[PDB]
Amino acid sequence: QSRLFINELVLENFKSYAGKQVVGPFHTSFSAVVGPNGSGKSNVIDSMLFVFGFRANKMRQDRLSDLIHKSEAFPSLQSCSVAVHFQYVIDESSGTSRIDEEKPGLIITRKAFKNNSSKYYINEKESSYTEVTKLLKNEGIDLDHKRFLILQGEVENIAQMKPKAEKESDDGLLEYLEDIIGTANYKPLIEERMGQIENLNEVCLEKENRFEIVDREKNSLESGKETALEFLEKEKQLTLLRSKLFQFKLLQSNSEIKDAETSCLSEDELRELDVELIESKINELSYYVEVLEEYARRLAEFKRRKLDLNNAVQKRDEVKEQLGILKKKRFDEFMAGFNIISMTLKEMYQMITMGGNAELELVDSLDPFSEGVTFSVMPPKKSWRNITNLSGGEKTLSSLALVFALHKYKPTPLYVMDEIDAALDFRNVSIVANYIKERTKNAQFIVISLRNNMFELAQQLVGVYKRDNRTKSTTIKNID
Amino acid sequence: MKVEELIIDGFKSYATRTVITDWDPQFNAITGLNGSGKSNILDAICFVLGIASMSTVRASSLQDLIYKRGQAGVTKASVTIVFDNTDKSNSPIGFTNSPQISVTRQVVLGGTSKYLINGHRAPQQSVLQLFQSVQLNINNPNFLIMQGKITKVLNMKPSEILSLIEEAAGTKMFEDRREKAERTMSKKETKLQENRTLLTEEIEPKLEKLRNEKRMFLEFQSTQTDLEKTERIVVSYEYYNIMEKIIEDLRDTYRERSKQLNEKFQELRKKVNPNIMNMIENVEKKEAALKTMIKTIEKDKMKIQETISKLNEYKRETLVKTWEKVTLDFGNIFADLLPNSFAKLVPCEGKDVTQGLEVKVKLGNIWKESLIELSGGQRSLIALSLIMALLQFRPAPMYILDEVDAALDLSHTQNIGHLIKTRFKGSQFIVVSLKEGMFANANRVFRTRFQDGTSVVXXXXXXXX
Amino acid sequence: SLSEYLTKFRELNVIIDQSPDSLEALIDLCHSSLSNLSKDIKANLSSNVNFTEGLIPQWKRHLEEYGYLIQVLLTFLQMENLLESITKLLEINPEKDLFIGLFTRPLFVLLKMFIQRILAMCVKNHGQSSSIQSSLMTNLTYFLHLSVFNAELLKLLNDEYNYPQLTEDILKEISTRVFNAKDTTGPKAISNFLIKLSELSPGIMLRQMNLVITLLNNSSITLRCSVVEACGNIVAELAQDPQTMEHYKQQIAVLIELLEERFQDSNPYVRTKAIQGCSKICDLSSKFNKSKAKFTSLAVRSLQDRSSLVRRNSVKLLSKLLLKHPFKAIHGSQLRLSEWEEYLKGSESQLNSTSVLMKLKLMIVYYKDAISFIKEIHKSIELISNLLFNRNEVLESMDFLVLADAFDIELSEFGIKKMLHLVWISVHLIECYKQLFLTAPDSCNMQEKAAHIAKNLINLSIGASIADLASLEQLLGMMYEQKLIDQHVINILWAIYNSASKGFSKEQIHGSIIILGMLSLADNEIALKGLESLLNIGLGAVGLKDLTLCRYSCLALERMVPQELEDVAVKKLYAIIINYTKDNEYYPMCEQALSALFTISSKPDILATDLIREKTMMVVSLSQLLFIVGQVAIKTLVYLEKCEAEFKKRKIDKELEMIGGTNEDFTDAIQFVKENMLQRTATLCLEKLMCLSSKYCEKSLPLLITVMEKSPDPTIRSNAVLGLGDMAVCVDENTDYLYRRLHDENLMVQRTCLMTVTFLILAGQGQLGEMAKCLDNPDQGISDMCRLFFTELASGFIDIFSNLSSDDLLGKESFKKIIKFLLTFIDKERHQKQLNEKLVGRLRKCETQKQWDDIAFXXXXXXXXX
């Protein structure tokens, strides 16, 4: 499978690049741009950030008109434009270079108009941002995270990053590794759900308890309602017996009709049916005499309400179990990716620094989402210390180790930086140089620094020079 | 009562028995320079009367009034007063047998006071009633022995003192305070009256239901009696028309149905209440209580307005009566005492008699408004005239005046003595002069001087159908 | 109209200041100058009437209505006037019962000498003890801050008025009434009342001591504290106004017995209150031979308590009884055990060999009491020294044993040693050390004081090991910034050291140079000056007699830098470097001498080459010392390389001569051929070569492991485990190999290996099973160190809990699993929610259920599952 990479850049009437500036072709494996201090590299990084729409937080919004050439000799020009080209390249086992399409792949341009106007043009045809970012994501370049961007801002943020997102905008180390593992927008949603649905379950359980108390009161009333109904049934039976006795007495002097016809065998059953006991039972019934709709009353409504409350409690338990299952499926791959990236950063720090060890660990040991994740570093001939009480060298070393672990975790064909290893020792610079030269072959990288060991291994040298306040770029190979 | 005998022995000054007699029954003037010796008499008199509301009489112990506080040989003080009681009218009831009242006041070491009325002991209430029978109070211009220090307060006085002097005979503020207290008491008792009315209104429905039950029971009894009479008539008719044993022992379906209905109604409306007499007695007692309560309510309602109207009428009548009488008397006294003069009572500035009245005087032929234009002698003279005109409201068979003549004049004292001898006849007057050289027209001038520490001078069916 | 008035409970000035209806109207109208004059005239007229003696009902009604209006005025609410009028009318003296009732009850509800006068002038009632008793009972049961005031009232009834009848009546009605423990803030108020009664006047509450026995057995603690303070104040007053009563003496005796019985109560508050009472009553003017004897014998056994404040109170008791000990008859302020022992021996020898008989027997019993007291204080010092090893108890208890050591006793040096071993807050210890160790008597001069201080430091510094002396010199350097030792003491100690070349019979000759090197660790200018004093002694002819003196002088000279390298110092040191074998000594001397020569020199490399060339010219002890000095030379060479590297880095370096400058010449081809007293140094050097470029590890780890796993010498095994623990910093993963020697036959090897294990985990670092198995092992010091390590790391617990639950299947330890589990469960994990469900998810044995009931290892789930 082939991968996409950039060949050259084109600038027209830039703030620091006046006129047409065509950069030479870049190397397929590794390239490097170089320029003196304050020569215009900031303009290059600003143009690169403006191409992908990632506007910086230093300049105010809708102020892209500054990208147009504004100087003393040219106070007003026509317009600004930048153009980047992309094409395919194949990486084989041995040293070679294969191409699947000899023609240029894509051409992305974004012009600026002094009335604060901008537009995206892919293949010299106008387009929007959603379609082009979806096409870039389909090609393996996701613009959701700035994986290709390496800036000292992220370094100083990680150096001050808390284990948890204590700031309302600054994401903590836990949120940082969440965006790293791609499961960032999975925790807050399920957390808000486990909060709101659980509150609803609590209030509906309180309502169900109230309904159960009402049903208990209804059952306490039914405890006497059933006795009243039994007394009414006994009174009805006594009245039926009295009617049968009256019919038998009226027939002897000559249910209800059946007993009357069977009275007057007939004479035997009339004269032998315990006349004395019949009179005694009649007297007892008359003494006891001197409800039926309770089954079809609010008692049944109370039972239905209790059943509805039980069903609501069952549904609450079911949704609670569902939320628990949803929150349980997270920490598995959470800890999996945690251990994976931990092993990658451990082996990277062991092969690069050859001394000490950097590692991110939970402040606790059981709950990964309890408080947060801290990051400790042990320099050579030293002990474990926090990332906040170290120097700049150890900070940028840990940062480059982390970004190398991220690159090894998720591949990316583009990578840019600007003076990240500035003011360090030449040993680590040579180490990262030979690492990016040998251990990395299936991607394109851009390094900007002043150290000597940087351009000694760069296959493509893109030198920028500023003459008469006009910057121009010249690209050459690494021939000797 | 005429003071013609005085016996003072065993006191702070009267250590020896001094002959004090030959008293004039018309005018008595006890003068001299011995002020303390003369004041000791009034001290002993007020000690007998039990007065202890004076800066010179009130002491921490009762032993101080004895000679040298009872520590210089005279350890006891015994005085005897003999009051002539020929006037049976002013004499108290039950004590008209003794022609002369003898009061022996003896005090010894310890502080015990003795009481003797014609040779009999008497508590403070008895002597208080005996004094009230002779018009001797505590908060009144009476007890002539000493009236106070009104003469000095009479100088630089607003109309308030004159209004209170007039009210001393008017006595309207006390009535106002008493009526305000009674009105507050009635307003407080209105709550209890409302509570009684509420209790009666809550009791009424019980008796109403009792009367209703009694009427229902009477109606049921009448219906039962009618049904029984109908049944008896039917039985008599059946016996006359005609197994006869049951008919003899017992003695138209609509009539039988009505009788059965009446019997059922009487059985279902028994309402056993054998205490109907007690019920009607309670009813009539409640009616009597209610009618008496309403009659008391209307009585007090009428009494309130009647008392208000009587207050207004009596106030106006007494106001005009005093504004005539005391004004005429003061004018006559000012014309008799001070020759060629006239003083009257006039409102302050277009005011009424209720607001207040001031005194307009006349020095010779010059009308003077305020007393500041008069000398101290004239102020003392008008104060003496006012205190002499004030004592006529509460008359007494005797009078004793004590040290009010500060700077009187010669001719003015002569005129005062002449008016006392002429206008004040029938009253036994004693006067103790503070400044000497005055009262040269007195018939008897007691020259009291200090010396040796003391003072010296079938058939049923046919019947039914 | 008394009953009616009790049930119901301007124009007036013209008659009040100058009749029944008028009086009633005035009373109704009256219901502040007018009221002042009214009360004044009423008071003086009532006084006059009472002085001069049918007239009583009027004055009775008048006083009743005036009391009623005064009551309503004080309840509705200048005050000084009405209080003065009340004092006037109360001193004048049925209806009197209700009178005093309505005069005290509203006054008690309302509630400063005026109020005291009111309460004093209202107790003149005769026969009304029931009413006042009920009122005071209601006060104690309802009011809290007034009860103490009531005590003051009893005071004005006790001595000011001198009426014992009412006092004893109130006392008996207070001691006979029933008390309850369910009252809120009631027992505390009663306790404060009795405390004030005992503090202001405890003499009257003594006569009824035979009745308060019921109150002495109260279940609550407030009344117990109150009654012990009461009897303390009582015996204080009895011993202060001796008055010499026999019944009061018997009461003192029986209450002292009650205090001795209550000293072992199950409450700290009552114990501390009894301690305060006995401390305030022991300093009275009396002898109390048997009393103080039993006090000391019962306090010497109860000092080892379990609470905090009771312990410090007991130490205060011991200090207070020690500072005022009655043993001051003969040679006071002296508690020498030998003196009392020889005196007792002489007395018992003269007894076996009549006033003289009485005097000798009293001397004998006094010596017996003295020796019992000295053995008691000795044993109490022993207990406190073995229990002290809460900061308040540490800072407060110092004065007691400091004063104890101030008196000459046989435990002086041992007591000082224990104090020093215990002290390692700081201001107190340094100030008492300045007061005691640096004392200066005014009778002696400056030179005598310096000599005394020198003798003191010599006799206290020459009787300890290396570790305690190191801690003592650290503490001394932490208190040397004040410049306590003057220049005269420095001169006299320098003179003593100079005269020590030759009262030092080998026990102080070494101690002098010991304290020299001990004090030189505080300042550098002390060792820089006076080099010739150590040249002719530490490196002169004296340096050939004893090698310990040479070692200590080398320490002293090495501590100079915190002569322009031209003196004879380095020459004399190199001359001493010559082989001094055939003796067990000379090891640490050379060990420190090589360092002293290398760390401070012009060029240590040429000197090291000269040494290694002149030494290898040369029975086996020679080669042993050669290997030793070569290894220490290469170690110090690495040290100087590192120090020069960091010096050049801190100048304000090519990074190739430090990390890469370890593959030079002088290999170890001869040091390892001896392995495959003799082999000791061989193993030491073979294990020390592990810091040479770290290649010796990857070269001969299996060889060293094999030769160390079968080492019969325990010292060699301890050296191996400490070297392996130190090698964890300089980095290879040698795990699962050092934990195999955690259980050996020798205890010293186990101690060393566990020490290195606990040290490497702090800096330079699973398999945490044996660290919990060694918890119930013998040699209790090991268990104490393990507990200290377990408590020090708590600065996750679920990890070690899972490790223990997984390793519990070892099947090796018996009857010690529950103990270890209870030991590791002291520090919780602050959640107590995840491990619960983790254990409910998987549990097999019954110990899981039993320790889940115990502490850790929901309730409904546990009940359902078990």
Curated annotation (Swiss-Prot), chain A:
A Pfam family that this protein carries is: SMC_hinge
Annotated residues that bind ATP are located at G35, P36, N37, G38, S39, G40, K41, S42
Q: Which SMART domains match?
A: SMC_hinge
Places the protein is found: Nucleus; Cytoplasm; Chromosome
Coiled-coil blocks: 291-330
Note what the entry says on domains. Answer: The flexible SMC hinge domain, which separates the large intramolecular coiled coil regions, allows the heterodimerization with SMC2, forming a V-shaped heterodimer.
Beyond the main fields, what else does the record say?
Present with 573 molecules/cell in log phase SD medium.
Family (UniProt): Belongs to the SMC family. SMC4 subfamily.
Q: How does it assemble?
A: Forms a heterodimer with SMC2. Component of the condensin complex, which contains the SMC2 and SMC4 heterodimer, and three non SMC subunits that probably regulate the complex: BRN1, YCS4 and YCG1/YCS5.
Role of this protein:
Central component of the condensin complex, a complex required for conversion of interphase chromatin into mitotic-like condense chromosomes. The condensin complex probably introduces positive supercoils into relaxed DNA in the presence of type I topoisomerases and converts nicked DNA into positive knotted forms in the presence of type II topoisomerases.
Q: What is the protein name for this chain?
A: Structural maintenance of chromosomes protein 4
| Protein's organism | Saccharomyces cerevisiae (strain ATCC 204508 / S288c)
Query: What is the organism lineage in this UniProt record?
Result: Eukaryota, Fungi, Dikarya, Ascomycota, Saccharomycotina
UniProtKB/Swiss-Prot annotation, chain B:
One GO biological-process annotation of the entry reads: chromosome condensation
- Which residues are listed for ATP binding in this entry? G32, L33, N34, G35, S36, G37, K38, S39
- Pfam families on file: SMC_hinge, SMC_N
Q: Has the keyword ATP-binding been applied to this entry?
A: yes
Q: Which GO terms describe its cellular component?
A: chromatin; condensed chromosome; condensin complex; mitochondrion; nucleus
Instruction: Classify the main location.
Output: nucleus
Cell compartment(s), UniProt: Nucleus; Cytoplasm; Chromosome
List the GO molecular function terms.
ATP binding; ATP hydrolysis activity; chromatin binding; DNA secondary structure binding; double-stranded DNA binding; minor groove of adenine-thymine-rich DNA binding
Q: How does it assemble?
A: Forms a heterodimer with SMC4. Component of the condensin complex, which contains the SMC2 and SMC4 heterodimer, and three non SMC subunits that probably regulate the complex: BRN1, YCS4 and YCG1/YCS5.
Report the domain remarks.
The flexible SMC hinge domain, which separates the large intramolecular coiled coil regions, allows the heterodimerization with SMC4, forming a V-shaped heterodimer.
PANTHER family tied to this protein: STRUCTURAL MAINTENANCE OF CHROMOSOMES PROTEIN 3
As for family, the record states: Belongs to the SMC family. SMC2 subfamily.
- Relate the protein's function as given in its record: Central component of the condensin complex, a complex required for conversion of interphase chromatin into mitotic-like condense chromosomes. The condensin complex probably introduces positive supercoils into relaxed DNA in the presence of type I topoisomerases and converts nicked DNA into positive knotted forms in the presence of type II topoisomerases.
Q: Further notes on this entry? A: Present with 3290 molecules/cell in log phase SD medium.
Q: What is this protein called?
A: Structural maintenance of chromosomes protein 2
Q: Which organism is it from?
A: Saccharomyces cerevisiae (strain ATCC 204508 / S288c) (Baker's yeast)
The gene for this chain is SMC2
UniProtKB/Swiss-Prot annotation, chain C:
InterPro entries documented for this protein = ARM-like, ARM-type_fold, CND1/NCAPD3, Cnd1_C, Condensin_cplx_su1, Condensin_cplx_su1_N
Pfam families on file = Cnd1, Cnd1_N
GO CC terms on record? condensed chromosome, centromeric region; condensin complex; nucleolus
Query: Which UniProt keywords are given for this protein, alphabetically ordered?
Result: Cell cycle, Cell division, Chromosome, DNA condensation, Mitosis, Nucleus, Phosphoprotein, Repeat
Which SUPFAM superfamilies does UniProt cross-reference here?
ARM repeat (SSF48371)
What molecular function does GO assign, one term? histone binding
- Is the Secreted keyword given for this protein? no
Where does the UniProt annotation locate this protein? Nucleus; Chromosome
Q: Where is the signal peptide?
A: none
- Asked whether the keyword Oxidoreductase is assigned, the reply is no
Biological processes, Gene Ontology terms? cell division; chromosome condensation; maintenance of rDNA; meiotic chromosome condensation; meiotic chromosome separation; mitotic chromosome condensation; mitotic sister chromatid segregation; negative regulation of meiotic DNA double-strand break formation
| Quaternary structure annotation from Swiss-Prot or TrEMBL | Component of the condensin complex, which contains the SMC2 and SMC4 heterodimer, and three non SMC subunits that probably regulate the complex: BRN1, YCS4 and YCG1/YCS5.
Query: What is the additional note?
Result: Present with 2540 molecules/cell in log phase SD medium.
- Free-text function comment from the UniProt entry: Regulatory subunit of the condensin complex, a complex required for conversion of interphase chromatin into mitotic-like condense chromosomes. The condensin complex probably introduces positive supercoils into relaxed DNA in the presence of type I topoisomerases and converts nicked DNA into positive knotted forms in the presence of type II topoisomerases. The condensin complex probably also plays a role during interphase.
Q: Which family does it belong to?
A: Belongs to the CND1 (condensin subunit 1) family.
Q: Give the protein name, as stated in the record.
A: Condensin complex subunit 1
Which organism encodes this protein? Saccharomyces cerevisiae (strain ATCC 204508 / S288c)
Instruction: Name the gene for this chain.
Output: YCS4
